[PDB]
């Protein structure tokens with residue numbers, strides 16, 4: 073609902089970084105850390121594209137993205153095919169976020185056309201799943217997140233901050249776009265959304281050479297934590313420069329652990 | 336297609352908690368409705384002796400109602416809102432089951448019990464806990480949108496005796512049939528649900544607790560405009576003067592209202608006269624609070640916080656956390672449904 077400190081997001085889904093890395097070990101027999109991060113970026117982009125095709129608002133997309141990340145923060149890449157999980161997450165997120173239930177034909181046509189059209193460099197073959205798969209996957213996704221469905225994102229507190237600063241017009245479009253970029257990282261699993269929003273607004277000020285040290289210094293907040301986030305954001309832009317997703321992803325997907333078939 | 340790892344799949348299936356393995360509930364149905372089915376149930380493993388309620392949601396899969404009720408109750412925690420103990424997802428048939436602590440009573444049955452023939456302490460205490468719960472819900476950006484006596488549970492004997500629990504989040508909404516409890520702005524086509532809409536429903540329930548009759552009772556009759564329900568409301572309340580509800584002019588159905596109704600029809604009608612026929616004193620703090628909840632213009636309706644602060648709740652007798660106040664509960668226990 074509307075107190076973050078009492079939310080299932082805060083109490084169950086803000087994770088320890090070391091435990092997260094520890095849990096990721098299962099999958100790092102197959103993939104380097106670099107490559108695992110690239111896969112995560114890749115599927116964040118797949119989810120973004122699915123939502124764009126379905127004309128869903130940024131909030132639904134973001135919620136879907138958090139579901140996808142929470143799922144693979146606990147379970148292996150081979151547990152459920154992420155190709156099925158991505159649209160499943162979008163489907164469930166549309167309901168939770170009050171858009172409603174995307175129709176059988178529309179969801180499957182979206183998955184089919186988005187992969188063929190925007191990701192053929194990674195997926196030579198057509199989307200092979202149907203609605204009966206989405207439905208079964210959705211049941212597993214719900215139980216496997218312990219029925220946690222309400223997610224807080226950094227957009228709301230960011231809007232509150234820029235308004236408070238009296239700088240909406242100036243700083244909002246860039247800070248907002250940077251929040252979008254944080255979904256390429258694990259930030260949403262690690263920090264309260266209001267801290268992500270402060271870090272993003274900080275990078276926006278720096279990029280736009282706007283001075284706000286005073287406004288920042290009189291917030292009652294752990295600035296050490298904000299700085300850690302700022303570093304992740306700077307690091308994601310260096311990785312973005314060095315990463316060519318279209319050239320690298322087919323090779324990285326074939327390395328990805330696949331589900332073991334029945335015996 | 337095999338989308339799931341085989342090892343992962345058998346492990347999950349081995350460890351899955353199954354409603355029919357954990358709970359005894361066959362032949363224990365106590366409610367049936369559009370919500371689905373409610374059962375009174377005991378733990379099979381005898382590890383405690385508590386009664387539990389099990390709600391099998393209407394339909395298959397994750398519908399909008401299942402989705403809302405899980406998503407919101409997962410987050411909410413207040414003594415006056417039903418607690419979601421557990422969710423069971425049944426994969427074979429795609430049924431969703433919710434587990435709650437069992438509430439022996441509810442306002443529908445309590446009010447009916449009295450009408451088939453209400454202590455003022457209990458009335459006040461009930462109202463106070465409804466407002467308490469709705470305020471909590473509101474403070475957390477949740478609109479209930481279907482408040483009615485059947486959704487106001489009261490706990491029986493046990494460690495929460497006489498505690499109100501608001502239930503059924505099936506229609507609830509983040510904001511950040513029978514129309515007796517429906518605010519008049521909705522009947523006139525207002526497009527948005529609002530906190531004020533919940534407060535009207537609570538005024539309807541309060542009147543009913545005072546008199547034992549649904550204040551806007553009306554027979555059954557698509558679009559939001561309901562002629563006869565409006566007619567019943569004007570017969571009780573009077574037809575609003577222009578200065579009582581200036582924005583009535585902006586309601587999508589206002590011209591339909593002007594076409595079907597003449598205010599002169601209701602000149603001797605008021606809430607005062609209605610409540611007087613039913614033995615509530617227009618003088619009473621009770622009455623004055625009721626009139627603030629049942630205000631036609633939603634922007635002139637009191638909020639739950641202000642209602643809780645009302646001097647009615649400072650007047651003797653004070654509201655109690657046990658609405659039955661240590662007295663003997665005369666209300667019959669729910670019966671088991673044995674029909675086909």
Ligand SMILES: CNC(=O)c1cc(-c2ccncc2)c[nH]1
Nearest residue numbers: 370373388435436437438502503
């Ligand atoms: C329409 N009714 C409902 O949604 C509902 C009833 C119960 C329940 C809980 C505890 N005891 C009795 C009934 C929970 N939800």
